Design an enzyme around this catalytic site. Structure first.
Site, PDB file in Angstrom:
ATOM      1  CE  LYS A   1      -5.228   6.137   5.463  1.00  0.00           C
ATOM      2  NZ  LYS A   1      -4.237   6.206   4.356  1.00  0.00           N
TER       3      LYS A   1
HETATM    4  C1  LIG Z   1      -9.115   3.733 -12.320  1.00  0.00           C
HETATM    5  C2  LIG Z   1      -8.745   4.183 -10.927  1.00  0.00           C
HETATM    6  C3  LIG Z   1      -9.873   4.828 -10.166  1.00  0.00           C
HETATM    7  C4  LIG Z   1      -7.496   4.006 -10.472  1.00  0.00           C
HETATM    8  C5  LIG Z   1      -6.992   4.510  -9.155  1.00  0.00           C
HETATM    9  C6  LIG Z   1      -6.234   3.409  -8.451  1.00  0.00           C
HETATM   10  C7  LIG Z   1      -5.759   3.794  -7.064  1.00  0.00           C
HETATM   11  C8  LIG Z   1      -5.387   2.538  -6.355  1.00  0.00           C
HETATM   12  C9  LIG Z   1      -5.670   5.017  -6.508  1.00  0.00           C
HETATM   13  C10 LIG Z   1      -5.233   5.246  -5.059  1.00  0.00           C
HETATM   14  C11 LIG Z   1      -4.983   6.741  -4.755  1.00  0.00           C
HETATM   15  C12 LIG Z   1      -4.738   7.055  -3.280  1.00  0.00           C
HETATM   16  C13 LIG Z   1      -5.634   8.125  -2.695  1.00  0.00           C
HETATM   17  C14 LIG Z   1      -3.798   6.412  -2.580  1.00  0.00           C
HETATM   18  C15 LIG Z   1      -3.419   6.699  -1.158  1.00  0.00           C
HETATM   19  O1  LIG Z   1      -4.170   5.926  -0.225  1.00  0.00           O
HETATM   20  P1  LIG Z   1      -3.330   5.122   0.943  1.00  0.00           P
HETATM   21  O2  LIG Z   1      -2.364   6.051   1.627  1.00  0.00           O
HETATM   22  O3  LIG Z   1      -4.290   4.431   1.900  1.00  0.00           O
HETATM   23  O4  LIG Z   1      -2.498   4.030   0.021  1.00  0.00           O
HETATM   24  P2  LIG Z   1      -0.954   3.571   0.308  1.00  0.00           P
HETATM   25  O5  LIG Z   1      -0.741   3.725   1.802  1.00  0.00           O
HETATM   26  O6  LIG Z   1      -0.879   2.133  -0.141  1.00  0.00           O
HETATM   27  O7  LIG Z   1      -0.068   4.496  -0.505  1.00  0.00           O
END
Ligand SMILES: CC(C)=CCC/C(C)=C/CC/C(C)=C/COP(=O)(O)OP(=O)(O)O
Ligand SMILES: Cn1cncc1[C@@](O)(c1ccc(C#N)cc1)c1cc2cc([N+](=O)[O-])cc(-c3cccc(C#N)c3)c2o1
Ligand SMILES: [Zn+2]
Lengths: 401, 314
Positions: free
Chosen positions: B110
């Site tokens: 990640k």
């Molecule tokens: C201005 C700016 C930089 C905005 C970006 C905001 C933002 C929250 C982006 C997240 C992108 C991402 C890699 C999510 C998946 O992680 P995960 O799988 O751990 O998340 P999830 O399981 O909740 O989908």
């Protein structure tokens, strides 16, 4: 009285159709954990009182703004973010930034600024759009002539151009990757500092719309799954470029509203994933954006006093499940506190308790009245007054060249 | 060479082969802000990284040092940039580097930088040989890793490796039919290969989706997929769907079926349908049931749809 504690709410628990998969099991685990928090009052025989722990959160922030433990070694390349998150959280909590702190922050971001434009994650680090967005925003929250002057506008524009791609997108940094976050970061700093040339965002609005997919939301790049973080970046960027219309605003609205968890009350970042306090901003913050987009489109059905998401429920989730007794906010019960989550949980709470569509203004403050926070601008996520103040200030100078 | 977590690891200021270089400490100014009290190992490694970066020393020891800097903070893009400079300048074996990044991603999947670095390598070597398999192993640990799916889509698009992906999608959908990432991948493969215009494919797809819905009525992913592949040409273009959905409403019901019905009615009311009077009421009834009973969390949205439908079909 409290939406999440009423008996009917129990019906909102996950129905797995007796078909178990990793998704249902993990959704059930978190739901079981949230139910405990909800029932803890009935359990301990106490009348529930939702209180935002301002004092606790203040000490946590006040101190972090100065120094952090080695637990944050992993953010050594994200210091301007730390400034932004903290300064903004204090801003939301309506806590003043002593002019001596403000100047030190200004001086620190100066060291972070690259000779060739933009800001790096720390002193001597190469420039990157994410910390550049954080610095400019941080400097704007301070809003002094000192802060504003820190930003080398000619170099910033120059740096932005060095990242622009032919297809309309932007690189996050030189020799770096591309995704919709860069589009927002660039549009955000460029608009606020008034350095937008006629061709800077040529094709950007179009590239961003290519990121909207079958789900209705927006992905990091064309073809990717819809995600709340990228969707906020996409729509907000478009609002800055006055091109929201480039998106199928109806499928987007249906997508984001469906991201609110019927049981937890908070939002998930993707369909079939877990709720998370920070998405109280990324997802719920989209509602004010669509409300405005549709209104300027002349929509006659828009509510006159509420956003199109359950404001009460989101405030209950944040207040009961996202606060750390020691100070700071978080993902969900069981998770550790951090400034990022502190910043977006508070930002999200602000949105949930403040409605405004032109002349109309209606609030909703769950729990004690002292819980009410300062309003936040849905596009930049800094005070509406800081937005107006900074834009007005940078319009005094012409766009570079 | 000397692992960062090895029992005999030695700080860089205590290494003979680094006596000539004087470390360059980080200048946070006289009145630090968000100052991190780094551990000994950390600031020792970065104090020397800064030295090597400033002198722009493109040496093998510098190359080895970046690895330690990366392990302490895989998110430091500046270090990753310098490492790519050394990779080319020192003419390092890129497959060896592929082995290295494979290992780091396994450890920290990640992270944006580790995946971008891998992309740069694959781009350099013009070799996607091990990509689909490497990604499958990461996805096997976290079926929804955003970075992994994005890398997979990139590799498939750039090197045209579509032939077996729909099968992979079916494998994972069988593992977890609720995996929204797989449904997205399914739409990704089909729209870039056959498309949803070939009636045989639209047929096959809607049948499969409806089939998965019967099995797991409350899985929002199957529903969103059905809506997404049909909303294109308009839901009212398919007359049989409406009642077919009404058939499993007394048994396979869910607030997801109710909402699709509303979606079918509003498209109808927008395409000159017979008995518009009765359909507008059917729609407004479902909207009310949703906002008041079946899906109250979205009450504000459903009351809006109710209003807007009136505003234009009254
Ligand atoms: C201005 C700016 C930089 C905005 C970006 C905001 C933002 C929250 C982006 C997240 C992108 C991402 C890699 C999510 C998946 O992680 P995960 O799988 O751990 O998340 P999830 O399981 O909740 O989908
Ligand atoms: C998916 N998710 C949901 N809740 C949190 C997450 C992140 O995994 C995530 C969020 C956004 C992006 C993007 N882009 C990447 C990862 C995440 C964890 C985390 C912890 C801290 N912390 O302070 O301990 C700081 C940041 C951080 C650092 C620098 C920039 C940004 C930003 N934006 C966030 C953290 O970020
Ligand atoms: Zn989060």
């Amino acid at each position: 009285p409290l939406y999440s504690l009423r008996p009917e709410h129990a019906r909102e628990r996950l129905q797995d159709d007796s078909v178990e998969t990793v998704t249902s099991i993990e959704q059930a685990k978190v739901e079981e954990k949230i139910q405990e928090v909800f029932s803890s009052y009935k359990f301990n025989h106490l009348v529930p009182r939702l209180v935002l722990q301002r004092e606790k959160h203040f000490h946590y922030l006040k101190r972090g703004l100065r120094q952090l433990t080695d637990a944050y070694e992993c953010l050594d390349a994200s210091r301007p973010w730390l400034c932004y998150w903290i300064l903004h959280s204090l801003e939301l909590l309506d806590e003043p930034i002593p002019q001596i702190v403000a100047t030190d922050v200004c001086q620190f971001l100066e060291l972070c600024q690259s000779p060739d434009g933009g800001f790096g994650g720390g002193p001597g680090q190469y420039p990157h759009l994410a910390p550049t967005y954080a610095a400019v925003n941080a400097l704007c929250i301070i809003g002094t002539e000192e802060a504003y002057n820190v930003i080398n506008r000619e170099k910033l524009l120059q740096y932005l151009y060095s990242l622009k791609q032919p297809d309309g997108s932007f690189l996050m940094h030189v020799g770096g990757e591309v995704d919709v976050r860069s589009a927002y970061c660039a549009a955000s700093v460029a608009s606020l500092t008034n350095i937008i040339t006629p061709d800077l965002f040529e094709g950007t609005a179009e590239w961003i719309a290519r990121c909207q997919n079958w789900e209705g939301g927006i992905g990091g790049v064309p073809g990717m799954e819809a995600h709340g973080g990228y969707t906020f970046c996409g729509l907000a960027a478009l609002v800055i470029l006055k091109k929201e219309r480039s998106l199928n605003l109806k499928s987007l609205l249906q997508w984001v509203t469906s991201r609110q968890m019927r049981f937890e009350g908070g939002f998930q970042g993707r369909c079939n994933k877990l709720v998370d306090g920070c998405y109280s901003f990324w997802q719920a913050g989209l509602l004010p954006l669509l409300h405005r987009a549709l209104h300027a489109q002349g929509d006659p059905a828009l509510s006159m006093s509420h956003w199109m998401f359950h404001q009460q429920a989101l405030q209950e989730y944040i207040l009961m499940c996202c606060q750390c007794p020691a100070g700071g906010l978080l993902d969900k019960p069981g998770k550790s506190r951090d400034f990022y989550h502190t910043c977006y949980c508070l930002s999200g709470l602000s949105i949930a308790q403040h409605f405004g569509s032109g002349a109309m203004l209606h609030d909703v403050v769950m729990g004690v009245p002292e819980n009410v926070l300062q309003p936040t601008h849905p596009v930049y996520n800094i005070g509406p007054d800081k937005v107006i103040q900074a834009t007005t200030h940078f319009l005094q100078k012409p766009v570079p060249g | 060479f000397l692992s960062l977590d090895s029992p005999t690891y030695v700080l860089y200021r205590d290494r003979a082969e680094w006596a000539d270089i004087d470390p360059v400490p980080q200048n946070d100014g006289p009145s630090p802000v968000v100052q991190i009290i780094y551990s000994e190992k950390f600031r020792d490694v970065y104090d020397y990284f800064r030295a090597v970066l400033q002198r722009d020393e493109r040496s093998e020891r510098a190359f080895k040092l970046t690895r330690d800097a990366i392990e302490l903070n895989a998110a430091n893009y500046t270090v990753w940039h310098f490492r790519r400079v050394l990779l080319r300048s020192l003419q390092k074996d890129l497959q060896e580097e592929m082995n290295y990044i494979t290992a780091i991603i396994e450890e920290q999947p990640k992270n944006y930088q580790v995946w971008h670095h891998r992309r740069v390598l694959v781009e350099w070597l013009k070799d996607p040989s091990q990509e689909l398999e490497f990604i499958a192993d990461i996805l096997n640990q976290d079926a929804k890793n955003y970075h992994a799916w994005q890398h997979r889509q990139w590799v498939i698009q750039e090197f045209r490796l579509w032939d077996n992906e729909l099968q992979y999608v079916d494998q994972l959908l069988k593992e977890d039919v609720r995996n929204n990432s797989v449904w997205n991948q399914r739409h990704f493969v089909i729209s870039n290969t056959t498309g949803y215009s070939d009636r045989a494919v639209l047929e096959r797809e809607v049948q499969y989706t409806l089939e998965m819905i019967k099995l797991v009525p409350h899985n929002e992913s199957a529903w969103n997929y059905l809506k997404g592949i049909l909303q294109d040409r308009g839901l009212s273009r398919y007359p049989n769907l409406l009642n077919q959905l009404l058939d499993l409403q007394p048994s396979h019901s869910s607030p997801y079926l109710i909402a699709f019905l509303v979606d079918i009615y509003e498209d109808m009311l927008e395409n000159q349908c017979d008995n518009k009077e009765d359909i507008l009421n059917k729609a407004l009834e479902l909207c009310e049931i949703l906002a008041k009973e079946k899906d109250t969390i979205r009450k504000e949205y459903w009351r809006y749809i109710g209003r807007s439908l009136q505003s234009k079909h009254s």
